[PDB]
Paper text:
The second and third steps of the histidine biosynthetic pathway (HBP) in plants are catalyzed by a bifunctional enzyme–HISN2. The enzyme consists of two distinct domains, active respectively as a phosphoribosyl-AMP cyclohydrolase (PRA-CH) and phosphoribosyl-ATP pyrophosphatase (PRA-PH). In this work, we obtained crystal structures of HISN2 enzyme from Medicago truncatula (MtHISN2) and described its architecture and interactions with AMP. The enzyme dimer is formed by two mutually swapped polypeptide chains, forming a bilobial protein—each domain forms one lobe.
The unliganded protein (with metals) crystallized in the C2 space group with two protein chains in the asymmetric unit (ASU). The X-ray structure of MtHISN2 was solved by experimental phasing using single-wavelength anomalous dispersion (SAD) on zinc cations bound to the protein. However, the MtHISN2 crystals could only be grown in the presence of a low concentration of Zn2+ in addition to Mg2+. There are two unique MBSs in the PRA-PH domain. MBS1 contains Zn2+ coordinated by two carboxyl oxygen atoms of Glu220 and one carboxyl oxygen of Glu217. In MBS2, Zn2+ is tetrahedrally coordinated by carboxylic groups of Glu214, Glu234, Asp237, and a water molecule. The MBS3 is formed by the carboxylic groups of Asp125*, Asp127*, Asp129* and by two water molecules in a shape of a trigonal bipyramid. In the next site, MBS4, Zn2+ is coordinated tetrahedrally by two water molecules and Nε of His143 and by the thiol of Cys126*. Lastly, Zn2+ bound in the MBS5 is coordinated by thiols of Cys126*, Cys142, and Cys149. A metal cation (MBS4) may play a role in priming His143; in the unliganded MtHISN2 structure, His143 does not bind a water molecule but instead is in the MBS4 coordination sphere.
Residue numbers in the entry:
A (entry chain B): 46 to 185, 194 to 265
B (entry chain A): 46 to 188, 195 to 264
């Protein structure tokens, strides 16, 4: 036949002809959105390289961004082990959620359950991006704030911690010391990034582009 | 009624009483696995802090790791905008897939369209972890610019110190942010070569940072 049809024949579609499709940020890992896909949606994602879904309510194919202009440009596609779940790994043109939120996932359940009569949405973030968010909040006196207001102290720390990290290899120190000094390097380097208005995602795009 | 019951009433369950549940590594962002959850599965994930699902084929609740011991320890739970999709954000005790793979997502589709008769599974990786994997592959092979650094500690440490100073210069000398991003990428790359020599994973570094807050 052809290769795409042969692969699509191997997907474990449900009894409506659908699989779960998850869009994920190729540079950061943030989950952008989750929908469903039929044969045509997956084939169209592959051929067009734009994340394409099937709407159960509209009984219709749709492409993220067809109205909003915020397309997800797809770098790769992965099936899970039993072939009923698909990741579209790609780079968003702009906020993925129709609400304007950066991703569709900003409703924290654990926060809802704490004893406090007040609600607040917040994007789901993994550890590296949570640190970036905390530093950005401090920028807008904690020790992070102290480092944001004393350039010379910060740069002295960045050079000092880089040297300490090197010394874990030069003096054959335990790998736990290496991980701890790398954490120190990363933290102070990210305070500098905040001062320069650079996002971690932008740094990771640079690394991707160099190894392209 | 209590807070969990009130929350579960606000989930947009499908006509089998299910929502999609996605387990995601809290430290790295890797998607570990995706299944379905009913009311009881979400309530049990919240109360036990272990990722819990409903099996459509077995019509039964199950907790990831109940046999394999590779539990996913849940740090937070998120709903999507229209409340029919759930992220279990958590830390796995070990590989999530029953096959032994670290995650359930190792079947790349674009490979099957190449020209050689060959197949090769590989974990889905985002940019930072893809670079980590490339360096590890260079370390494993025998007789390349990355390979040069893996085989010369003194050149490598020289570069790390040099690059850290370059990054500082972008602030001290008020350079454009494009320069700062480029120098941070230099710092990251060379540091990650040292991590490879020390057998340290990026995930272990990010765990350290999370634990400090
Ligand atoms: Zn399986
Ligand atoms: Zn599956
Ligand atoms: Zn949304
Ligand atoms: Zn020292
Ligand atoms: Zn240190
Ligand atoms: Zn919505
Ligand atoms: Zn949804
Ligand atoms: Zn699996
Ligand atoms: Zn440089």
């Amino acid at each position: 036949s052809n290769a795409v049809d042969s692969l699509l024949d191997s997907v474990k579609w449900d009894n409506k002809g659908l699989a779960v499709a998850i869009a994920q940020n190729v540079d950061t890992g943030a989950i952008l959105m989750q929908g469903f896909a039929n044969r045509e949606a997956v084939a169209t994602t592959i051929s067009s390289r734009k994340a394409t879904f099937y709407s159960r309510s509209r009984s219709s194919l749709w492409t993220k961004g067809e109205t909003s202009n915020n397309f997800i440009n797809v770098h790769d596609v992965f099936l899970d082990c039993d072939r009923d779940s698909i990741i579209y790994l790609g780079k968003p043109d702009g906020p993925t959620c129709h609400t304007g939120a950066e991703t569709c996932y900003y409703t924290p359940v654990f926060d809802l359950l704490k004893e406090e009569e007040v609600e607040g949405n917040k994007l789901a973030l993994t550890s590296l991006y949570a640190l970036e968010s905390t530093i950005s909040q401090r920028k807008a006196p904690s020790w992070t704030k102290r480092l944001l207001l004393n350039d010379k102290l910060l740069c002295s720390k960045i050079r000092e911690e880089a040297n300490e990290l090197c010394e874990t290899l030069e003096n054959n120190e335990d790998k736990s010391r290496t991980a701890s000094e790398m954490a120190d390097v990363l933290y102070h380097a990210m305070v500098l990034l905040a001062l320069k208005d650079v996002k971690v995602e932008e740094v990771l795009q640079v690394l991707r582009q160099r190894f392209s």
